[PDB]
Design a protein around this nucleic acid. Structure first.
Ligand SMILES: [Mg+2]
Lengths: 258, 227
RNA sequence: UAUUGACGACCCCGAUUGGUUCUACUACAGUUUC
């Protein structure tokens, strides 16, 4: 799963939260203007765009302080073993040897298909039933591939530079990020292809927060969380973040505007 | 319009039991084992016109699933919850073999695991990192269904919701027929005889009384002799 | 005028987006010889 994909789902939920709070509609904007909203411009970053905003000429672009890694499966296959899957031609024929190979059950298809399972789908015509002419398709569903933990790296130094040093200003950005992670753990952020079509819903078992050199008022972040609702973060800390967050909701200024 | 496979109401006890037995030639409580391909000469008709299934999900098994919904208006949400809260003995039809009676399912809500809020409720939820209480939507559930029912009454102008033609028809699909006649493909013999000459009901119909397929809401059965 | 007489499977992917926007050179050394 590319980090591009995991970043993009996180960004989308972060924006929906911000726009929801402000009740700011997204429908009349083109895509480059849809992306450009508060706090996410600092966390996820913004396109370079020069503007003569005030006779002064300024760049709106800044890099994302939040970076995401590609997430790979624990399962692995030799390069030719997968080339046997890409080049199978009979779902009940030569595909079955290839998946038995790649899933690591070369003699046991009923275990092989607990890892990668071919699915067939039809579109069913609404007057006749049966199936719509041409509308038959199939999916190799990785029903049982196990995945390694997702790594998100938040550059606190880069945000703090955007806010011209003021660590008070981190709390709305940190508050947003924790709200995004709360939804991820509550199955509110599906990932990958076909999310509305039988794929993409993840269970989160544990979020580990491990910062280095955090400022002392953010030091409570260093935690391993297993409650989806963040209840493993200190209530005084969650209540502090809620306060700085609510104070920003009451006036959602461009927080890096000095 | 939209084709639907009415629920096979009133199939007798044991109809799905012991399914390898070729009961198709005998009317147990008046139903032939209509889902089974008859044996011919006492051997199984594994012809290339049909499939065979090694097993099936037993009746009364149970599944849970969740529906996650975004920005549904009270009319669009009202329609959905009506389908999930149809009165008793309404059943949805799922999966394959529906003409043969397979795949009838009962849907109902688990209200103790449902959490619907309007966007103003989510402004509160995303307002704080502390736990903040959800609305008890079960007070509203009846309001939403009526928003749907009145919109259908209003647009498809009718003196009742249940008198709207696609509503009345859809009800009989979900509920099945009540006249206790069997559901099977048209055939000119009561038994499913092993050769399966269903076409000759249509030729008897064609030379004879030329019945059209009755209206779904009328619950009118075809005669076995359409002549 | 209305007879003749029983067989048989089908669909195999379809539609679409295929790059969009910003930066396009900026500082200089322009003659040197204690
Ligand atoms: Mg296909």
């Amino acid at each position: 799963i590319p980090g591009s994909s995991i970043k993009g789902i996180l960004r989308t939920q972060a924006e929906r939260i911000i726009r929801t709070i402000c009740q700011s509609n997204g429908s009349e904007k083109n895509f480059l203007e849809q992306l450009r909203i508060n706090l996410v411009n600092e966390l996820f970053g913004s396109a370079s765009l020069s503007q003569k905003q005030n006779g002064k000429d300024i760049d709106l672009g800044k890099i994302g302080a939040l970076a995401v890694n590609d997430c790979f499966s624990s399962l692995s296959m030799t390069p030719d073993q997968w080339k046997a899957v890409e080049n199978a031609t009979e779902m009940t024929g030569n595909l079955q040897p290839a998946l038995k190979q790649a899933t690591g059950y070369p003699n046991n298809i009923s275990q092989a298909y607990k890892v990668l399972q071919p699915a067939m789908h039809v579109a069913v015509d609404r007057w006749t039933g049966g199936a719509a002419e041409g509308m038959l398709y199939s999916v190799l569903e990785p029903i049982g591939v196990t995945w390694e933990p997702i790594q998100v790296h938040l550059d606190i130094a880069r945000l703090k530079n955007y806010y011209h040093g003021k660590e008070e200003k981190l709390k709305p950005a940190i508050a947003l990020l924790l709200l995004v992670l709360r939804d991820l753990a509550n199955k509110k952020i599906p990932v990958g292809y076909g999310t509305n079509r039988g794929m993409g819903t993840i269970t989160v078992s544990q979020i580990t927060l491990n910062g280095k050199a955090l400022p002392t008022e953010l030091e409570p972040l260093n935690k391993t969380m297993t409650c989806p609702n963040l209840t493993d973060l200190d209530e005084a800390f969650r209540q502090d973040l809620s306060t700085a967050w609510k104070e920003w909701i009451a006036d959602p200024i461009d927080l890096c505007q000095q | 319009g939209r084709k639907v496979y009415p629920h096979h109401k009133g199939l007798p006890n044991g109809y799905w039991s012991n399914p390898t037995e070729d009961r198709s030639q005998q009317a147990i409580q008046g139903h032939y084992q209509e889902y089974r391909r008859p044996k011919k000469d006492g051997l199984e008709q594994r012809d290339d016109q049909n499939r065979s299934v090694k097993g099936w999900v037993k009746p009364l098994t149970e599944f849970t699933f969740e529906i996650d919904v975004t920005n549904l208006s009270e009319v669009e949400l009202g329609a959905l919850l009506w389908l999930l809260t149809l009165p008793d003995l309404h059943f949805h039809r799922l999966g394959g073999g529906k003409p043969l009676g397979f795949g009838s399912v009962r849907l109902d809500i688990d209200p103790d695991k449902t959490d619907l809020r309007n966007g103003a409720g989510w402004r509160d939820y995303y307002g704080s990192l502390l736990e903040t209480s959800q609305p008890d939507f079960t007070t509203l559930i009846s309001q939403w269904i009526n928003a749907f029912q009145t919109a259908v009454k209003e647009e498809y102008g009718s003196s009742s919701f249940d008198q709207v033609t696609f509503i009345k028809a859809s009800g009989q699909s979900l509920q099945g027929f009540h006249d206790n006649a069997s559901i099977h493909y048209p055939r000119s013999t009561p038994e499913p005889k092993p050769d399966g000459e269903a076409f000759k009901w249509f030729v008897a119909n064609e030379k004879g009384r030329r019945l059209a397929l009755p209206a779904l809401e009328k619950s009118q059965s075809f005669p076995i002799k359409p002549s």
